[PDB]
């Protein structure tokens, strides 16, 4: 029944402001703090701060007094959450929390906004070949893959000969690059004895810039 | 107001008993909540006020504690328990611990290697990125050392691991040097030398430009 859903994905430049929002229902909205939360890439949880609907009280982690504003309406139950001065390090999954039943602890949280902050604009990915060959053959079982490089904002899909084959895939996470860029790499071992038989292509799909590409890689 | 959580990563079995701990710098109390969190989802309640389970949260977890250490204890470990764990001091403040990811125990295993040189492809553009794989290795601490005409680079590679994998519980390693066409074509002898706890001695994989 209780549920908070947030607005969606964002991508902004440094400096720049981000203002997200957080729906609240199946509980009074005003009568309970909305909390704030954040999560950078394959890091851990963060507090940011916290209000009191009704009167617009407000209290903000140490770090982030000055930069954050929290805000409520509730007239219309939702809460928002500003960030200003912009950085890359603001990059992170931005999430809003409440505790309904006054448990002492975020019993309902939001499915999480994704904020990337870059000097980059939206842009697809080139894709090269991670070539089999004799450096990357071990017994019976070869290596290839794909680079998938200079892309933004997260998240891109790759599959291999459309989702057929699945065994022996490994699909890495992304590093973000000086450049403000992102690149990944995608890899599967097979048998060297079907390299020069068997087809093997990467599907890559990069949705925030509707860039789509298969990738044939040969020995 | 600091929460800190030993050990960040556990190693264990289905159906064992595990048992994590968070310590505050200062007395909180019975302020404690404990939530648990898999990648790419929001996180989950399991316990608050330190020992109090969450409705709906399986009896097999529990928790106590009070004043500066605490624990979470997980009976008979499921499947679905292997994720990672986070304290966080519900007193003043909310601050969260570092967080502990419970992890598939299994035997060292040491990793494949494997190098990639830059495709004509890429080089055409004006970059080399040269791709270091280290495939189904555990545990998961291994190290990589760019070497080019045998200088070890630094700062100019970055690299990613998986998650656990689904069918052997190891860990592959991606490992990415890059370097500008002109210096690229400016070296000869380009090299990854790999370390793992499961290697006697370093493994090197390499290549020469022009091989």
């Known amino acids: 029944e209780v549920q908070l859903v947030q607005s969606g994905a964002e991508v902004k430049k440094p400096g720049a402001t981000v203002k997200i929002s957080c729906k609240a229902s199946?509980?009074?909205?005003?009568?309970?703090?909305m909390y704030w939360v954040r999560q950078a890439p394959g890091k851990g949880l963060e507090w940011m701060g916290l209000?009191?609907?009704?009167?617009?009280?407000?209290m903000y982690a140490e770090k982030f007094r000055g930069r954050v504003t929290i805000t409520a309406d509730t007239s219309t139950d939702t809460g928002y959450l500003e960030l200003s001065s912009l950085r890359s390090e603001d990059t992170a999954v931005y999430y809003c929390?409440?505790?309904?039943?006054?448990?002492?602890?975020?019993?309902?949280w939001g499915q999480g906004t994704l904020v990337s902050v870059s000097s980059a604009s939206t842009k697809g990915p080139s894709v090269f070949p991670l070539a089999p060959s004799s450096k990357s053959t071990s017994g019976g079982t070869a290596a290839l893959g794909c680079l998938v490089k200079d892309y933004f904002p997260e998240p891109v899909t790759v599959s291999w000969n459309s989702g057929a084959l699945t065994s022996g895939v490994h699909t890495f996470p992304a590093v973000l690059q000086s450049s403000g860029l992102y690149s990944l790499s995608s890899v599967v071992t097979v048998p060297s004895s079907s390299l020069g038989t068997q087809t093997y292509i990467c599907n890559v799909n990069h949705k925030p810039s509707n860039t789509k590409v298969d990738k044939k890689v040969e020995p | 107001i600091q929460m800190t959580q030993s050990p960040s990563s556990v190693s264990a079995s289905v159906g064992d008993r595990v048992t994590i701990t968070c310590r505050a710098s200062?007395?909180?109390?019975?302020?404690l909540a404990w939530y648990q969190q898999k990648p790419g989802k929001a996180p989950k309640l399991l316990i608050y006020?330190?020992?109090t389970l969450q409705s709906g949260v399986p009896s097999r977890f529990s928790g106590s504690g009070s004043g500066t250490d605490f624990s979470l204890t997980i009976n008979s470990l499921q499947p679905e328990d292997f994720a990672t764990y986070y304290c966080?001091?519900?007193?003043?403040?909310?601050?969260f611990g570092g967080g502990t990811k419970v992890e598939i125990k299994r035997t060292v295993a040491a990793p494949s290697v494997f190098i990639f040189p830059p495709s004509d492809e890429q080089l055409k553009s004006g970059t080399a990125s040269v791709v270091c794989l280290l495939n189904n290795f555990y545990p998961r601490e291994a190290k990589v050392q760019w070497k080019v005409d045998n200088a070890l680079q630094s700062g100019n590679s970055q690299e990613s691991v998986t998650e656990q994998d689904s069918k052997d519980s190891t860990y592959s390693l991606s490992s990415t040097l890059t370097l500008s066409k002109a210096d690229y074509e400016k070296h000869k002898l380009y090299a990854c030398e790999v370390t793992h706890q499961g290697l006697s001695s370093p493994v090197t994989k390499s290549f020469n430009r022009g091989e």
């Open positions: 199946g509980y009074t909205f005003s009568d309970f703090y």
């Open positions: 209000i009191d609907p009704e009167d617009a009280d407000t």
């Open positions: 006020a330190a020992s």
């Open positions: 200062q007395d909180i109390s019975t302020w």
């Open positions: 966080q001091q519900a007193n003043s403040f909310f601050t």
């Open positions: 929390a409440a505790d309904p039943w006054e448990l002492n602890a975020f019993n309902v």
